[PDB]
Amino acid sequence: PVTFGKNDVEIIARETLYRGFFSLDLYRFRHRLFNGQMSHEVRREIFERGHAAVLLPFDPVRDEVVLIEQIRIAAYDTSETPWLLEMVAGMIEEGESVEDVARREAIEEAGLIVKRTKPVLSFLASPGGTSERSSIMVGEVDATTASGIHGLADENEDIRVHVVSREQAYQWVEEGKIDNAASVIALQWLQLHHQALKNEWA
Amino acid sequence: MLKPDNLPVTFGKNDVEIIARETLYRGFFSLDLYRFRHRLFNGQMSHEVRREIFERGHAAVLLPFDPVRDEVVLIEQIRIAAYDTSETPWLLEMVAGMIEEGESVEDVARREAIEEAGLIVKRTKPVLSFLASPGGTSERSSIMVGEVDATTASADENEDIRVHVVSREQAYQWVEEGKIDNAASVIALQWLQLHHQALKNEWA
Ligand SMILES: [Gd+3]
Ligand SMILES: [Gd+3]
């Protein structure tokens, strides 16, 4: 399929336009046109904010899924509410594995202890404006042991756990009641592979 | 009075308030800074919270699908941002384009289908709209499946965009193996692998 590779691109230079907690970078480069020639200097503004580790909490026996609720203001302007139904996830720091970063966040965010995890898919949220990459992973868990609201909240990441059936969470995806990238993919992947997974596990 | 809309979530837009939006940087793509407060699940009010948001505009995505031949039309194209975490910045994607004032999702989809793939979309169908990374971007992409005729595959941006026609099954397998890892394509192709027989019957 794809022809060209990293030797077909010459990155002239990069710059940081802004730098707070997250940075916005500038990539200047030239590449192979599909007709064989190189292109002029091309410019692209790239949002650089690290890579993500995701984790789909799935209870094989009960055939349920554990969802995480929280606010995401970014969603405000194009959704009925900034509060979203999500998967477990954290930003991958220094030299951490996605597996660990994912199991570590399953305790913190949903108070669950993942037992047996399996990789799903690794995607780019939007190659057109951000270098961010997400690795999903499916994780076996007992829905029954989820935690609840925190009396003394984490205003940074204030979370409310939601436990629903596998089949339902999926309809919410099809219904548009679950529209963040990580969730839709993971849940879509589950709908296509659940029967095989319930048998492999349990 | 009129009853409140339903929410599969606990709080609505009325439970948070956006104090302001300072601006960190501005290009054709801006980086804004939201300052806001909101209810916590413990029933209390949060102190002021600041968050950097990549304002990137919103897109229109189209999945070129040939029911009768059961093929899909892909677009190959470079996306520098994948350089650092991919073996190649050249990705296989769907027909997409930015939606701007006075334009409907279906319009951009139909327009971009001709200038990127040189295909003429017949019947279209709303599949699903998703948020890329609500934790740092406001971006939103709406998807549609476009009834196409793979033989008609062509194309304007040809030196900047190469079109590939493959069968549904081969495309999906490339998502499974990771040869297709961009959100728009992954979400689209999975949806299709779950509905094709019904879509083929519908457009039959
Ligand atoms: Gd955390
Ligand atoms: Gd265009």
Query: For every residue of B93-160, which 3-state class applies, written as one string?
Result: ECEEEEECCCCCHHHHHHHHHHHHCCCCCCCEEEEEEEECCCCCECCEEEEEEEECCHHHCCCCCCCC
Contact between B63 and B94 under an 8 Å Cβ cutoff? The reply is yes
| Active-site residue flag, A41 | no
For residue A12, count other CB atoms closer than 10 A to its CB.
Answer: 11
Nearest residue to B8 (alpha-carbon basis) of A179, A107, A139, A64? A179
- The reply to whether B167 touches chain A by the CB within 8 Å rule is no
Burial label for A50, CB within 10 Å (0-12, 13-18, 19+), is middle
In DSSP notation, A101-144 reads: HHHHHHHHHH-----SEE---EEES-TTTB--EEE--EEE--GG
> In Å, what is the CA distance from B167 to each residue of A74, A90, B70, B164, B174?
37, 36, 6, 10, 11
B81-107 burial, b for 16+ CB within 10 Å, e for fewer?
bbbeebebbbbbbbbbbebeeeeebbe
Question: How far, in whole angstroms, is CA B127 from its chain's centroid?
Answer: 11
Nearest residue to B14 (alpha-carbon basis) of B27, B23, B5? B5
Q: What resolution does the deposited structure have, in angstroms?
A: 2.7
Question: How far, in whole angstroms, is CA B72 from its chain's centroid?
Answer: 17
Residues in Cβ contact with A94 at an 8 Å cutoff, skipping those fewer than 6 apart: none
For residue A54, count other CB atoms closer than 10 A to its CB.
Answer: 28
Radius of gyration of chain A (CA): 20
In DSSP notation, A155-199 reads: SSS--EEEEEEHHHHHHHHHHTS--BHHHHHHHHHHHHHHHHHHH
Helix, strand, or coil (residue A42): strand
C-alpha B162/C-alpha A81 separation (Å) is: 39
Record: contact A125-B183, CB cut-off 8 A: yes
Residues in Cβ contact with A123 at an 8 Å cutoff, skipping those fewer than 6 apart: A133, A134, A136, A181, A185, B181, B182, B183, B186
| Distance between first and last Cα of chain A | 39
Question: Which residue's structure tokens are 């960190």?
Answer: B24
Residues in Cβ contact with A162 at an 8 Å cutoff, skipping those fewer than 6 apart: A66, A67, A68, A69, A85
Nearest residue to B129 (alpha-carbon basis) of B119, B139, B140? B140
C-alpha A119/C-alpha A117 separation (Å) is: 7
Residue B110 main-chain phi, psi, to 5 deg:
-65, -35
Indicate left, alpha or beta for A56 from its phi (over 0: left) and psi (-120 to 50: alpha). beta
Residue A15: CATH number of its domain: 3.90.79.10
Give the H/E segment covering residue B199.
helix B183-202
| Enclosing domain of residue B113 | 1-204
- The reply to whether A47 touches chain B by the CB within 8 Å rule is yes
For residue A167, count other CB atoms closer than 10 A to its CB.
Answer: 12
Contact between B166 and B150 under an 8 Å Cβ cutoff? The reply is no
Technique behind the model: X-ray
Q: How many domains does chain B have?
A: 1
Burial label for A15, CB within 10 Å (0-12, 13-18, 19+), is exposed
Give, as one character, the DSSP assignment of residue B43. S
Cα A99 to averaged position of ligand 2 atoms, centre (Å): 39
C-alpha B41/C-alpha A69 separation (Å) is: 10
Taking the alpha carbons of A107, A109, A111, A117 in that order, is the dihedral positive or negative? negative
Taking the alpha carbons of A167, A169, A172, A174 in that order, is the dihedral positive or negative? negative
- Residue B112 annotated as binding site: yes
Burial label for B124, CB within 10 Å (0-12, 13-18, 19+), is middle
- Per DSSP, chain B holds a count of helices (H) and strands (E) of 3, 10
C-alpha B105/C-alpha B118 separation (Å) is: 18
Pick from B55, B137, B164, B167 the residue to mutate for testing the A interface (most A CBs within 10 Å).
B137
Strand partners, B74: B164
Here the contacts of A13-20 (C-beta below 8 Å, separation 24 or greater) are: A17/A45, A17/B25, A17/B27, A17/B31, A18/B24, A18/B25, A18/B31, A20/B24, A20/B33, A20/B52
Choose, from A41, A140, A155, A167, the residue flagged as catalytic.
A155
Which amino acid type is present at position A54?
V
Which amino acid type is present at position B8?
P
- Residue A58 annotated as binding site: no
